[PDB]
Write a protein that binds this ligand. Structure first.
Ligand SMILES: CCCCCC
Length: 198
């Protein structure tokens, strides 16, 4: 349910924030929240970007606008500032979700534990977040990934058949993956990416 990538790949800020604000609730689909540190990270960053955007939606109409306006505003401090920094981290939590969901949809699993999703959560964490966490934070995120629900309970919860659920996730993944990949491409192109750990 994300907007299709526009012809020119300039992602509009407001509709983006609106769409991705629907993602933290899925971490609540089993009742007690799952992967809470990932949820909290995404949520907190969305809030920070929306706060900058809301001050001047026309100035911050696109995500590229955020980066270029804040670069001008903040000089040498940029990109470790403002909505740019928040989106730098948001894209990592969003990529976590992308890789996790794609891995599940592709039937990736531990053949000895086919109803767990630990292999899929570990893979997603490795590709999206792990490089950017210190040892304390790694232990936090690690505990959450380990306490993942059963695969069957996860799929049930999103469907509140299993194959039909997976088809819907695959559909979602098309514009979702493209959008995230465009954000990553922009960060690299603008030299807005930082590698510091938390
Ligand atoms: C945890 C995010 C799930 C999103 C499914 C559409």
């Amino acid at each position: 349910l994300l907007k299709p990538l526009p012809a020119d790949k300039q992602i509009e800020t407001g509709p983006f924030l609106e769409a991705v604000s629907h993602l933290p609730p899925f971490f609540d689909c089993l009742g007690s929240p799952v992967f809470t540190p990932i949820k909290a990270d995404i949520s907190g960053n969305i809030t920070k970007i929306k706060a900058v955007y809301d001050t001047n939606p026309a100035k911050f109409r696109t995500l590229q606008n955020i980066l270029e306006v804040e670069k001008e505003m903040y000089g040498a401090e940029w990109p470790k500032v403002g909505a740019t920094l928040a989106l730098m981290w948001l894209k990592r939590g969003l990529r976590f979700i992308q890789v996790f969901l794609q891995s599940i949809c592709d039937g990736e699993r531990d053949e000895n534990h086919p109803n767990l999703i630990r292999v899929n959560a570990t893979k997603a964490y490795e590709m999206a977040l792990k490089k950017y966490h210190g040892w304390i934070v790694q232990k936090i995120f690690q505990a959450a990934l380990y306490a993942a629900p059963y695969k069957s309970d996860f799929l049930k919860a999103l469907s509140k058949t299993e194959e039909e659920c997976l088809e819907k996730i695959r559909l979602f993944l098309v514009n979702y993956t493209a959008t995230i990949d465009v954000i990553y491409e922009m960060y690299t192109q603008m030299n807005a990416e930082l590698n510091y750990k938390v």
